[PDB]
Amino acid sequence: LPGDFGPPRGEPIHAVLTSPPLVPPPVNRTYPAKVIVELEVVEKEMQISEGVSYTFWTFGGTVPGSFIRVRQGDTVEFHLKNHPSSKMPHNIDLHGVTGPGGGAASSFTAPGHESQFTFKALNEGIYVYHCATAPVGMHIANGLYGLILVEPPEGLPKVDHEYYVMQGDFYTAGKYREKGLQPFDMEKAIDERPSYVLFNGAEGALTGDKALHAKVGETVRIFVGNGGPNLVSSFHVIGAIFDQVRYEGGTNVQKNVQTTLIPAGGAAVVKFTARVPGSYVLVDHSIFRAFNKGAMAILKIDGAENKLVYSGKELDSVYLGDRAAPNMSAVTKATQASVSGTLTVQDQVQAGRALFAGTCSVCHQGNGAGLPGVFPPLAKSDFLAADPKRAMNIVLHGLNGKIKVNGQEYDSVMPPMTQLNDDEVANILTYVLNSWDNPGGRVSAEDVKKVRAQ
Amino acid sequence: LPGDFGPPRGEPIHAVLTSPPLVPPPVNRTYPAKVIVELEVVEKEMQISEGVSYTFWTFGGTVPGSFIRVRQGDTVEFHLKNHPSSKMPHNIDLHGVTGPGGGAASSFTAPGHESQFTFKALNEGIYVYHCATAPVGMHIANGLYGLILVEPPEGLPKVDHEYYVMQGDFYTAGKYREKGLQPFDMEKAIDERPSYVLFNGAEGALTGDKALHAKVGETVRIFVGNGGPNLVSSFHVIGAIFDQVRYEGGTNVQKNVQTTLIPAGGAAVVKFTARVPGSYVLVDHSIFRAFNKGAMAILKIDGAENKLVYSGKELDSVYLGDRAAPNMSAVTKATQASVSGTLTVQDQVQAGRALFAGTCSVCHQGNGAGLPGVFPPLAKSDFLAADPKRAMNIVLHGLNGKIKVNGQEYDSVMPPMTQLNDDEVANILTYVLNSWDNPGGRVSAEDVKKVRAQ
Amino acid sequence: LPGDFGPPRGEPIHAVLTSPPLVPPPVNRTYPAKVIVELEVVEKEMQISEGVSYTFWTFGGTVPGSFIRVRQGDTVEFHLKNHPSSKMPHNIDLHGVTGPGGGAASSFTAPGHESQFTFKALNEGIYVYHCATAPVGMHIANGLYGLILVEPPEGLPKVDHEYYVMQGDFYTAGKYREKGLQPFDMEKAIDERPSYVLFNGAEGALTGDKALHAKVGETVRIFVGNGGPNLVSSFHVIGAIFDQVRYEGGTNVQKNVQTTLIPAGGAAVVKFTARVPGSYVLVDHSIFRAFNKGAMAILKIDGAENKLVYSGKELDSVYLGDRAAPNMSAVTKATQASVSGTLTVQDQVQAGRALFAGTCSVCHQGNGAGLPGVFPPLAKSDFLAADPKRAMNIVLHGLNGKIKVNGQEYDSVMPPMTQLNDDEVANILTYVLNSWDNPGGRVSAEDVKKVRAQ
Ligand code: HEC
Ligand code: HEC
Ligand code: HEC
Ligand SMILES: [Cu+2]
Ligand SMILES: [Cu+2]
Ligand SMILES: [Cu+2]
Ligand SMILES: [Cu+2]
Ligand SMILES: [Cu+2]
Ligand SMILES: [Cu+2]
């Protein structure tokens, strides 16, 4: 058999697991060991987006689940606990396991119970693990997946940073960015029509102040999973190249590629060398996923510019939209205040400020000045002030034809933005009304609901 | 030109074709030959699922079509017959053919006719063949695809077993497991929204008593096709690894991978070495295909357990659901009895028994005992007996909140199972009512139809 | 850094860009240069299909955009102009650029403006470029993508022909082949449900009289892009094989494959050697794309037949359908005449003639004779003449059961063809009525609209 390095030696090792986006240290070991792995399933509400709650099913309290790191030839004694608060039974199938179900039958664990099974890690490589409990698709869709690394006996080459990034497709009853606790939607899941496509279980999980970091000249290894359940990632780094891409434990290594297809349930190790400073975007290049459903993550490189290599500027809201900023905490706060019935004008203003970035600023500018004769101003806009209800219709349904704004004619097209939710339109317009010498007041979600219906 | 091994020598060879999942023997030949291939298109009803009929269009009476095996450098005289019972014209495009349409124009065959054309097999490799008749997508969707192997001149390395597995996506007017003769649905096909995703033309075609077999220590080669028409397979073996994956006649060979993307119209040769006994599941790891639409096949390995490699148990209904069992013949029988108007309580009981596995047993257990205080019993259930109509509502629409069953409180969540068809709910509940000291009687599909509508 | 060939030498080079499907000449240069690239965004209506207009956003007036060809180690001074007629701002992200956004922030260009940035081409390979302006998916969906080749320092091996082919998915409010100016459909785009899947921005862009050409014995290199935004191409050549497939600047080269997966945003260089004459079809082998949404392109090879390799005939309308013919200009003319209110019987006849190929002729024959007792005649058809309204119902809704046509019984199935638009049914039936001694007259789109509604 492969991984024939003899019986376990030394002492039993209690595996130290890490939460995304971090990785356990290299095993740094020349002998096979008995490794004891303890992983606990926890079902809990978390924010899938600002003001959007979801009942996740998690391995270790995170999506993706805790990272497991062992050595080819190790004997793994795998313990799965199911927290007493769980409503569902759970189990595990680890890719890389030699045996039926990858552990599934022997890891069946009711709420408040523990199971264990033992396997030899015969196969080096990076591998997806996931729940294997009927209905399997529901369990995986709710977040039950992670990565296990089985190192080659000599270890992977040294790098400056190792990170853990895992794509998933998610299925909410509500539409993208519709607030509240969103149930799982079985019909969307069966049709492979996700409402969100995410890295690490949430919109913005790896953007802004949650970005990954490295410095010019450093090497970065990323362990990239695709939990699915259903989508295949056109996995891509914007503005860079992968030195290496290696799938699972494959003998093949692709070098010097920017775009690479990761199967549903697949995993790859990618290597990046930082050359010039700025934000490098990991995306699913099935572009509506990346830019309309949340499938973007950032590796931010600090260090000296090299104008001979790249003369240009850091990413901004034109490309990254409302994820250019450190966070959108104001949207969470405004949503909470709406639930509590304490929503203030300033709550709306700060939420709208966050949402205006990219969505509106690409044309109207961050200062609302637009571009005379090309993009009309929102700053001190007579046309806006004259009819706040018209402004709701313009955001939802677009605007075209000749108009006059602050004494100048425009004859252009503002596309409809019907995908914005009632609260988003209300908060954006309240921000605009309370900025740039506009007349103040507020737009409510209910105001926008009425315009959308007629 | 490649395959330049000279003119055909020896005697003309009448190719012996095989039905899935079997493969013709190695050609075992050191000279190029004239190989005569005879393939007949037959249009006929077959069961795509238990009690679900479909009008398949087949090469050789099977989906996928008969397997063709020749040697690089052979001259192939290809004869296509279209059975007189056919309503449609048919033809063939074989991948690996050097020439326009891969044979399409010269193989146009009306019902009751025969065509022939000759090609040299210049290209070694495994290749999809399919019908190439307008509307091409309709012909392929109805099952008109198979594999042709063009061996390298020295032959493939010897293995213990060779099998033939081909994925397809299928488009029925009715939903998944809706009984009766299901028309092709053009609108679902254009939108790439299949109702079934299958190996070898049916649900359960390669599960249970139809599984592929090998023994511990043996090598298994699988010729894997993806007929499409539309889907790309995240092709995966649960609980194992592929020693090798080779696409078409590619120079590249990937080794030691578990998950591999097979394009629509693509084919690969995979190699497996049996290490420990049990069921190894071939899936499309776009998971809702595998677990909600039929895309699972089994390679069952017999032999001695090795607890040092894997301590765990064989697959069961928790993972495989209602395909853990040898077959679901009872569902076919009950459906037939419904059509004939002779449906008995015991017909329903046996159909429900088959469908209860995984679907209900994952939580309620195979004996209906559940888990006190966690999963309420269906065995001798006062709550079930008290209101059979409520039980229909619970299966369709779920149940949550505090309830009392057999003297114990539950406060958990049973998800809705609205995807079950009226007959499936009726048969499952009739099985439960006639098991475990429950009060007997029956639930009808019409009973369930009324609850679903209100 | 890679591409470390020193500072630019010689004179600054003004890059000569080419329109699809042509490629600039090899750079044929042994020193690194400063290359000045000028690319202008133009928003304009073009025909996405005959009689179907679309507002494309283009780099250089074409979809895909102008081809850029430079040498690894070059310093590229990139100038982006946005034509004054533009309504939207635009920018660029070139894959292969080392720097944040691949140029996006520094190339933001309002209508009537110009931007520039400088990058070193460190990375050899074929790369997608695309617009990177919020909403990014909308910009890409409207056609803003192309290819940049960064040659290795020694150049690519010499071939007889180099061509430029780029797949895209498109999202119209109307259905496939519904006439008129079709708006972008955001809801279809978010759901990844394209109405058209095309090579080079239109149906028939590379078919018939727009086919690519080469001769027997010649080598053809194709630079293949996938602009997306959303789809992954099961990229395939019908009746041939790729000698080589190389993705982006990857070290890996696959040889001797026919079917290859191109990620969304991906690019590959493929090599073909012409062996026998005829039409070789480039398709997305997700077959409904290729045969129902426009995803087919032709490389037509002229030269001597070799009956030892392939005895068969050139492609015809059975496989290629209504794209077997040089063009479908008659459909454009008839659509124009309908708009102008000058639609004649002969306008309809010529449009119907073009649309009858494959769609109807596969069964009824190009001469309408059918096959006695198998496919009933449309030529001098008593059954057709007897009830023109029935003929509309038959095309839309199909026909089955026993009928009598010209004295002979038929007992077969004509599938429904509801996907044909009202004008297409009207024009096809007007062609049939005015051919083969049929009674003449005409069917109007309004006639067909009424039958479809009842
Ligand atoms: C460029 C693609 C735009 C984006 C994104 C947004 N707007 Fe816009 N807007 C745009 C144009 C070209 C026009 C004029 C259309 C015409 O008929 O010529 C407008 C118009 C408005 C108006 C009314 C005029 C004014 O007060 O300046 C409002 C109130 C407005 N737009 C608001 C707005 C908001 C809030 C946006 C984000 C949700 C937004 N616009 C995006 C161009 C573009
Ligand atoms: C776990 C995910 C479950 C699956 C799968 C099925 N059931 Fe269930 N069921 C489950 C729970 C946790 C509960 C109690 C909910 C609560 O409010 O606490 C139930 C309840 C029932 C009942 C009513 C109570 C009883 O008689 O025990 C019935 C009749 C019932 N469930 C039937 C049933 C059938 C037939 C299933 C397969 C179609 C099925 N359940 C699946 C948990 C789960
Ligand atoms: C084969 C798959 C067919 C294609 C494609 C089309 N037609 Fe057809 N048609 C076909 C059959 C087998 C039948 C007879 C059905 C039966 O009940 O036996 C028909 C019938 C007609 C008729 C009526 C009979 C006649 O006049 O011959 C008409 C007017 C007709 N078909 C027209 C038609 C047109 C215009 C098509 C392209 C849009 C078309 N058919 C396609 C088989 C097939
Ligand atoms: Cu689970
Ligand atoms: Cu898996
Ligand atoms: Cu056919
Ligand atoms: Cu094909
Ligand atoms: Cu743009
Ligand atoms: Cu890109």
TrEMBL record, chains A, B, C:
Cu(2+) 1 binds at residues 90, 131, 139, 144. PANTHER family: ALCOHOL DEHYDROGENASE CYTOCHROME C SUBUNIT (PTHR35008:SF8), BLL4482 PROTEIN-RELATED (PTHR35008). Keywords: Copper, Heme, Iron, Metal-binding, Oxidoreductase, Repeat, Signal. GO terms for molecular function: copper ion binding; electron transfer activity; heme binding; nitrite reductase (NO-forming) activity. The gene is nirK. Belongs to the multicopper oxidase family. Its cofactor is Cu(+); Cu(2+). Pfam families: Cu-oxidase_3, Cytochrom_C. The keyword Repeat applies. It is found in: Periplasm. Binds 1 Cu(+) ion. NCBIfam families: Cu_nitrite_red (TIGR02376). Heme c binds at residues 360, 363-364, 381, 412, 414. Residues 347-436 form the Cytochrome c domain. It comes from Ralstonia pickettii (Burkholderia pickettii). Its EC number is 1.7.2.1. Cu(2+) 2 binds at residues 93, 95, 130, 285. InterPro entries: Cu-oxidase-like_N (IPR011707), Cupredoxin (IPR008972), Cyt_c-like_dom (IPR009056), Cyt_c-like_dom_sf (IPR036909), Cytochrome_c-type_DH (IPR051459), NO2-reductase_Cu (IPR001287). This is Copper-containing nitrite reductase. GO terms for cellular component: periplasmic space.
